[PDB]
Write an enzyme that holds these catalytic residues in place. Structure first.
Site, short mmCIF file in Angstrom:
data_model
loop_
_atom_site.label_atom_id
_atom_site.label_comp_id
_atom_site.label_asym_id
_atom_site.label_seq_id
_atom_site.Cartn_x
_atom_site.Cartn_y
_atom_site.Cartn_z
N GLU A 131 0.84 -1.23 0.00
CA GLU A 131 0.00 0.00 0.00
C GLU A 131 0.86 1.26 0.00
O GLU A 131 0.63 2.18 0.79
CB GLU A 131 -0.99 -0.03 1.11
CG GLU A 131 -1.95 -1.21 1.08
CD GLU A 131 -2.99 -1.20 2.13
OE1 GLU A 131 -3.02 -0.31 3.01
OE2 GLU A 131 -3.81 -2.18 2.13
N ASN A 172 2.52 -5.24 -3.07
CA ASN A 172 1.05 -5.57 -2.87
C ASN A 172 0.28 -4.32 -2.64
O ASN A 172 0.72 -3.43 -1.93
CB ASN A 172 0.97 -6.51 -1.67
CG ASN A 172 -0.37 -7.21 -1.50
OD1 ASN A 172 -0.82 -7.89 -2.42
ND2 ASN A 172 -1.02 -6.99 -0.35
N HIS A 208 -9.93 -6.45 -3.07
CA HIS A 208 -11.06 -6.15 -2.18
C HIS A 208 -12.15 -5.46 -3.01
O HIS A 208 -12.04 -4.22 -3.21
CB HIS A 208 -10.61 -5.35 -1.02
CG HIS A 208 -9.67 -6.05 -0.10
ND1 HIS A 208 -10.03 -7.19 0.57
CD2 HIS A 208 -8.38 -5.84 0.20
CE1 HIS A 208 -9.01 -7.63 1.28
NE2 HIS A 208 -7.97 -6.83 1.04
N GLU A 238 -5.85 -11.01 -1.85
CA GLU A 238 -6.71 -10.78 -0.68
C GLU A 238 -8.20 -10.71 -1.15
O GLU A 238 -8.97 -9.89 -0.65
CB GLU A 238 -6.36 -9.52 0.08
CG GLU A 238 -4.87 -9.37 0.41
CD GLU A 238 -4.50 -8.20 1.19
OE1 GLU A 238 -5.36 -7.41 1.66
OE2 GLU A 238 -3.24 -7.99 1.39
N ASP A 240 -11.91 -10.66 -1.87
CA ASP A 240 -13.21 -10.72 -1.26
C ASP A 240 -14.11 -9.77 -2.04
O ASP A 240 -13.60 -8.85 -2.70
CB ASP A 240 -13.23 -10.53 0.24
CG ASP A 240 -12.56 -9.30 0.76
OD1 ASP A 240 -12.44 -8.29 0.04
OD2 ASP A 240 -12.11 -9.31 1.96
O1 LIG Z 1 -6.94 -0.09 5.11
C1 LIG Z 1 -7.09 -0.56 3.73
C2 LIG Z 1 -8.43 -0.14 3.23
O2 LIG Z 1 -8.49 1.30 3.17
C3 LIG Z 1 -8.45 -0.57 1.80
O3 LIG Z 1 -9.90 0.00 1.40
C4 LIG Z 1 -10.21 -0.06 0.01
C5 LIG Z 1 -10.67 1.35 -0.41
O4 LIG Z 1 -10.83 1.42 -1.83
C6 LIG Z 1 -11.70 0.29 -2.02
O5 LIG Z 1 -13.08 0.50 -1.89
C7 LIG Z 1 -11.18 -1.08 -1.86
O6 LIG Z 1 -12.29 -1.86 -2.19
C8 LIG Z 1 -11.10 -1.26 -0.37
O7 LIG Z 1 -10.47 -2.48 0.06
O8 LIG Z 1 -8.60 -1.97 1.73
C9 LIG Z 1 -7.32 -2.67 2.12
C10 LIG Z 1 -7.02 -2.08 3.56
O9 LIG Z 1 -5.78 -2.49 4.15
#
Ligand SMILES: O[C@@H]1[C@@H](O)[C@H](O[C@@H]2CO[C@H](O)[C@H](O)[C@H]2O)OC[C@H]1O
Ligand SMILES: *[C@@H]1O[C@H](CO)[C@@H](O)[C@H](O)[C@H]1NC(C)=O
Length: 319
Positions: A131, A172, A208, A238, A240
């Site tokens: 990230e 990642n 996600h 990851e 989902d």
């Molecule tokens: O903390 C982070 C979350 O902020 C990250 O959230 C995202 C935001 O953009 C999206 O809507 C994506 O679907 C979500 O997963 O998700 C991983 C997490 O570590």
């Protein structure tokens, strides 16, 4: 017979799942996590993060990470190891420190060397940096970026490679699965690491997603091939697909097609080595605590019963 057998029949290395240590005391949960027809690979959801593994500086702690490895080893499952450098789930000593470039670099490198050496030989892949990007493709202003600048990323990779030359080193991130500034910037990370002379083996695509708002198979595949063109492998790390609650038959069916396209995108892209879902049962999903109003994200429900998404995944894997 299951997701992992289907994945491997199409040339993927694995289908797998994350888990977390509190779940390993639930015997019915463990039985299905250990079913190698469905899961050939395990990721620790929390116990290899920095707060878990280096709670004080130079004071490492591996019991919880090792318990997850031990379960995968018992089952003959691969590990993905997650994650060395990330702005979240840092212990207080990192986030509160008065750092210079030299002192944070020393702490970061020491963290990497110790954790990677500890797990040498034990991981298929590491998520070395997690990230690092904003949504516009600029660098996330973490402590590492503020103090070290962009070089923290290749330095992290190089440090991991020195400690374990064999393990696949991944970058990642989320929202890098669809075409856009963020994905392009993830490609640029790959390029930057190599321009530094450091090793990077893979791009990890968190995946996600949201039911009815999931990237299409065609865009997913364009994006995967935008990374494999660079001479790296890829994986969905990851996966989902969260639904806006309440759950309904129609939403469950949409979730199935959404999951189907993910699997099929991976199969369609040589160099996509696998899919990991972020746990496997709705009971233990991280989603409802983070995304208010969303849930039911996984191929099995909270009673450990397959949902239509299980069949969608099988269909996308050509099984
Ligand atoms: O903390 C982070 C979350 O902020 C990250 O959230 C995202 C935001 O953009 C999206 O809507 C994506 O679907 C979500 O997963 O998700 C991983 C997490 O570590
Ligand atoms: C920190 O030092 C390394 C040299 O060890 C360098 O690559 C990096 O660019 C430096 N960063 C900052 C902000 O000085």
């Amino acid at each position: 017979a299951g997701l992992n057998t289907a994945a491997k029949a199409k040339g993927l290395k694995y289908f797998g799942s994350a888990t977390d240590n509190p779940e390993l005391t639930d015997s019915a949960y463990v039985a299905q996590l250990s079913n190698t027809d469905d899961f050939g690979q395990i990721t620790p959801g929390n116990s290899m993060k920095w707060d878990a593994t280096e709670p004080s500086q130079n004071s490492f702690s591996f019991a919880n990470g090792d318990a997850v490895v031990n379960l995968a080893n018992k089952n003959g499952q691969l590990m993905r190891c997650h994650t060395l450098v990330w702005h979240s789930q840092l212990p207080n000593w990192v986030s509160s420190g008065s750092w210079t470039n030299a002192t944070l670099l020393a702490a970061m490198k020491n963290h990497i060397t110790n954790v990677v050496t500890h797990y040498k030989g034990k991981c298929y892949a590491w998520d070395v940096v997690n990230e690092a990007l904003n949504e516009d493709g600029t660098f996330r202003n973490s402590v590492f970026y503020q103090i070290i600048g962009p070089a923290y990323i290749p330095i992290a990779f190089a440090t991991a490679a020195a400690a374990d030359p064999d393990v696949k080193l991944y970058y990642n991130d989320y929202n890098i699965e669809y075409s856009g500034a963020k994905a392009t910037a993830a490609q640029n990370i790959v390029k930057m690491i190599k321009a530094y002379g450091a090793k990077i083996d893979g791009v990890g695509l968190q995946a996600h997603f949201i039911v009815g708002s999931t990237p299409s198979q065609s865009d997913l595949t364009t994006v995967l091939k935008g990374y494999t063109a660079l001479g790296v492998e890829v994986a969905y790390t990851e996966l989902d697909i969260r639904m806006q609650l309440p759950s309904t038959a129609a939403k469950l069916a949409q979730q199935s097609t959404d999951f189907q396209g993910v699997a099929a995108a991976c199969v369609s892209t040589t160099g996509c080595v696998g899919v990991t879902i972020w746990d496997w049962t709705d009971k233990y999903s991280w989603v409802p605590s983070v995304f208010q109003g969303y849930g039911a994200p996984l191929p099995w429900d909270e009673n450990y019963v397959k949902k239509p998404a299980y069949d969608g995944l099988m269909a996308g894997l050509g099984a």
